[PDB]
């Protein structure tokens, strides 16, 4: 069983753009998420909303995020918080100009890597590998997380989380533009709706208005 969803915000750029239309494969036997899977779930804070993010932390993982390099660190089996197993190989490629630019006043634009937009900032694209599964992420170079607003886990140092059983840690590929687990905690197994497997339609559009055209080129699988 599948279910189509529309992508209104840019929290998953560049992997998923605003105006995209995705196909979600219901988890439900009811399979579980795999580290790196794009998952759609009920937003804990407000279950009336469906959120889409990447499952970076599975039950037992010790997640650490460096606000400066903006890189993840995962250590599986850190269940009982014991001197858990080796660090999951999390590899990053060299930062490079992405194909979009964020403007302020609020707004994203696919722009030729040589151009610049007034009151805008070229976002940095780069690849991240969560074990064996590789995907891209964007970063705004003039921004950095304010650890203060981070959700702090009872007994955990700031910017570090030990995922509880039957819980997951979610993060958006548009790393400096994503209200994810870094701010509101974990997601329970029950809230998980499914895995996003493909884009079936895509309209070049700025959130809040109608389409500027099509992007048939994006129809295909994602990961």
């Amino acid at each position: 069983i599948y279910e189509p969803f529309q992508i209104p915000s840019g929290s998953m750029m560049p992997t998923l753009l605003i105006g995209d239309f995705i196909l979600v494969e219901k988890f439900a036997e009811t399979g579980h998420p795999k580290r790196g899977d794009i998952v759609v779930f009920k937003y804990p804070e407000d279950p009336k909303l469906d959120y889409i993010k990447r499952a970076v932390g599975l039950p037992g993982d010790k997640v650490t995020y460096d606000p400066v390099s903006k890189e993840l660190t995962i250590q599986p089996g850190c269940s009982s918080g014991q001197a858990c197993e080796n660090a999951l190989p999390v590899t990053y490629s060299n930062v490079e100009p992405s194909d979009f630019v964020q403007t302020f006043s609020s707004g994203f634009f696919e722009v030729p890597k040589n151009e610049t937009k007034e009151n805008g900032i070229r976002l940095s694209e780069r690849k991240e590998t969560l074990g064996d599964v590789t995907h891209r992420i964007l970063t705004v170079p003039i921004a950095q997380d304010q650890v203060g607003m981070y959700y702090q886990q009872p007994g955990q140092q700031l910017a570090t989380w030990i995922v509880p059983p039957g819980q997951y840690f979610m993060m958006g590929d548009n790393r400096d533009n994503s209200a994810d687990s870094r701010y509101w905690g974990f997601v329970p197994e029950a809230n998980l709706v499914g895995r996003a497997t493909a884009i079936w339609m895509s309209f070049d559009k700025q959130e809040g208005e109608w389409p500027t055209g099509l992007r048939l080129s994006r129809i295909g699988g994602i990961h």
Binding site: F5, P8, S9, S11, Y43, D50, Y51, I52
Partner: peptide, 6 residues
């Protein structure tokens, strides 16, 4: 279906 996913 349809609908959004933030």
């Amino acid at each position: 279906x349809x609908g959004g996913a933030y």
